[PDB]
Design a protein around this motif. Sequence first.
Motif, PDB file in Angstrom:
ATOM      1  N   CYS A  10      -1.502  -6.875  -2.434  1.00 19.32           N
ATOM      2  CA  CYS A  10      -1.387  -5.984  -3.596  1.00 19.32           C
ATOM      3  C   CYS A  10      -2.765  -5.435  -3.970  1.00 19.32           C
ATOM      4  CB  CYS A  10      -0.780  -6.680  -4.788  1.00 19.32           C
ATOM      5  SG  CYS A  10       0.828  -7.422  -4.493  1.00 19.32           S
ATOM      6  N   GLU A  11      -2.787  -4.224  -4.390  1.00 16.40           N
ATOM      7  CA  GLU A  11      -4.048  -3.664  -4.937  1.00 16.40           C
ATOM      8  C   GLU A  11      -4.390  -4.318  -6.255  1.00 16.40           C
ATOM      9  OE1 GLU A  11      -4.442   0.647  -4.829  1.00 16.40           O
ATOM     10  OE2 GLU A  11      -5.860   0.676  -6.434  1.00 16.40           O
ATOM     11  N   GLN A  12      -3.418  -4.590  -7.087  1.00 16.47           N
ATOM     12  CA  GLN A  12      -3.636  -5.081  -8.453  1.00 16.47           C
ATOM     13  C   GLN A  12      -2.845  -6.384  -8.549  1.00 16.47           C
ATOM     14  OE1 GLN A  12      -3.144  -2.061 -11.490  1.00 16.47           O
ATOM     15  NE2 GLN A  12      -4.759  -0.803 -10.653  1.00 16.47           N
ATOM     16  N   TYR A  13      -1.726  -6.449  -9.229  1.00 16.95           N
ATOM     17  CA  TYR A  13      -1.134  -7.680  -9.622  1.00 16.95           C
ATOM     18  C   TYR A  13      -0.008  -8.050  -8.663  1.00 16.95           C
ATOM     19  CZ  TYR A  13      -3.658  -6.266 -13.785  1.00 16.95           C
ATOM     20  OH  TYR A  13      -4.717  -5.767 -14.609  1.00 16.95           O
ATOM     21  N   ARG A  25       2.507  -5.213  -8.728  1.00 15.61           N
ATOM     22  CA  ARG A  25       2.663  -4.449  -9.953  1.00 15.61           C
ATOM     23  C   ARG A  25       1.283  -3.809 -10.281  1.00 15.61           C
ATOM     24  NH1 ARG A  25       2.729  -7.751 -13.259  1.00 15.61           N
ATOM     25  NH2 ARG A  25       2.708  -9.725 -11.988  1.00 15.61           N
ATOM     26  N   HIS A  27      -1.318  -2.162 -13.508  1.00 19.57           N
ATOM     27  CA  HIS A  27      -1.649  -2.156 -14.942  1.00 19.57           C
ATOM     28  C   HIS A  27      -1.068  -0.911 -15.569  1.00 19.57           C
ATOM     29  CE1 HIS A  27      -4.700  -4.024 -17.717  1.00 19.57           C
ATOM     30  NE2 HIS A  27      -4.585  -2.869 -18.325  1.00 19.57           N
ATOM     31  N   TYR A  30      -1.121   3.134 -14.552  1.00 21.53           N
ATOM     32  CA  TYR A  30      -1.022   3.259 -13.049  1.00 21.53           C
ATOM     33  C   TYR A  30       0.473   3.116 -12.718  1.00 21.53           C
ATOM     34  CZ  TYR A  30      -6.056   2.082 -12.736  1.00 21.53           C
ATOM     35  OH  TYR A  30      -7.424   2.083 -12.787  1.00 21.53           O
ATOM     36  N   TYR A  45      -7.564   8.743 -18.104  1.00 23.76           N
ATOM     37  CA  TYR A  45      -8.593   7.708 -18.269  1.00 23.76           C
ATOM     38  C   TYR A  45      -8.029   6.349 -18.122  1.00 23.76           C
ATOM     39  CZ  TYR A  45     -11.463  11.557 -19.893  1.00 23.76           C
ATOM     40  OH  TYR A  45     -12.214  12.719 -19.996  1.00 23.76           O
ATOM     41  N   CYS A  47      -7.729   2.417 -17.109  1.00 29.48           N
ATOM     42  CA  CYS A  47      -8.703   1.342 -17.251  1.00 29.48           C
ATOM     43  C   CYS A  47      -9.465   1.098 -15.990  1.00 29.48           C
ATOM     44  CB  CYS A  47      -8.167   0.070 -17.789  1.00 29.48           C
ATOM     45  SG  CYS A  47      -6.996  -0.797 -16.682  1.00 29.48           S
ATOM     46  N   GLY A  48     -10.748   0.684 -16.081  1.00 27.33           N
ATOM     47  CA  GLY A  48     -11.463   0.160 -14.938  1.00 27.33           C
ATOM     48  C   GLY A  48     -11.877   1.208 -13.897  1.00 27.33           C
ATOM     49  N   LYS A  49     -11.810   2.478 -14.230  1.00 27.15           N
ATOM     50  CA  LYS A  49     -12.343   3.587 -13.446  1.00 27.15           C
ATOM     51  C   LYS A  49     -13.404   4.334 -14.195  1.00 27.15           C
ATOM     52  CE  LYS A  49      -8.648   3.598 -10.103  1.00 27.15           C
ATOM     53  NZ  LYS A  49      -9.248   3.058  -8.898  1.00 27.15           N
TER      54      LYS A  49
END
Lengths: 58, 250
Positions: A10-13, A25, A27, A30, A45, A47-49
């Motif tokens: 997974c890229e994230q969760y 999943r 955030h 996204y 905007y 988060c985290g970019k």
Amino acid sequence: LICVNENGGCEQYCSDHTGTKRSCRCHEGYSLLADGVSCTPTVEYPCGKIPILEKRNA
Amino acid sequence: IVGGKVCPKGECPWQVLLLVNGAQLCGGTLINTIWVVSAAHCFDKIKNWRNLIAVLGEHDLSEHDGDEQSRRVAQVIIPSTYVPGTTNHDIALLRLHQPVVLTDHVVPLCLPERTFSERTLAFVRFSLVSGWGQLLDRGATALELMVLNVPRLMTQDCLQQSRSPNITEYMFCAGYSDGSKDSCKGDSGGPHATHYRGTWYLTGIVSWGQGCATVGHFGVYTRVSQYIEWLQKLMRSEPRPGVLLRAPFP
Ligand SMILES: CS(=O)(=O)N(CC(N)=O)c1cc(Cl)cc(CC(=O)Nc2ccc3nc(N)[nH]c3c2)c1
Ligand SMILES: [Ca+2]
Ligand SMILES: [Cl-]
């Protein structure tokens, strides 16, 4: 695939489910691509970019 | 920050400056438009809870460029387990009185899920720490926001390498033991941000250390993964009158 190794791909969760099942999943701000692993922003905007860097490479 | 570099303006867009009667207090991290994470120990000596201001989009404290956004702090939420005058459980959740407007210079850092943070982010070696704190131990604070890449240690290794508070399960060490590069006083409350596959996440809060850039010692950070569920529940709650709130932990 299992979430403990390589984050389940997974890229994230990552969530494990009963069987050889895994669900990735993303955030808020996204959405999950059809690959089932990648997350792409859905807002200006997320988060985290870093906007000035994301514009430098677009 | 000791031994770092100026964070190019807009490259640390989650960094928060906390002011009390216009004076620099501490850093913080924006995690969505009304919520800031900082360090509990920043608030031990607040006399007038109603004069705490959070500034987003700040860069050079000498000038106003129009990207700054100031908000009153409406609530300071601290875990029941934090004891003033001590180091453990060093986290605060701040609610702003009005949302900030997200812009190229004001962006939240992602608050990760706990599992993700524990199983994945905790093993990313290097992360960024930032702030307007002291540039040297016993030295002047910075006018431009500073940033430093620091590597994280497993706690057994920190304890083995270090030579007094314990490092608890609510903390981790990061940095260098050669006196060259560190966080410092004044950086408290700021982010320790970890990159994974194109996105940055909150993994620590600048908390404490033995001096700064002290040979044989590392900086100590609040282990934010312990507090994800606590933070998330609070962000779903209604506000309560009175700035300071102590909330049960776990
Ligand atoms: C002594 S106390 O009563 O426990 N208390 C007093 C108070 N509440 O103000 C307190 C608690 C905490 Cl947790 C932190 C500090 C100050 C501090 O250590 N700053 C700091 C910050 C970053 C660093 N990076 C490095 N390498 N060293 C750092 C130091 C004070
Ligand atoms: Ca400025
Ligand atoms: Cl009050």
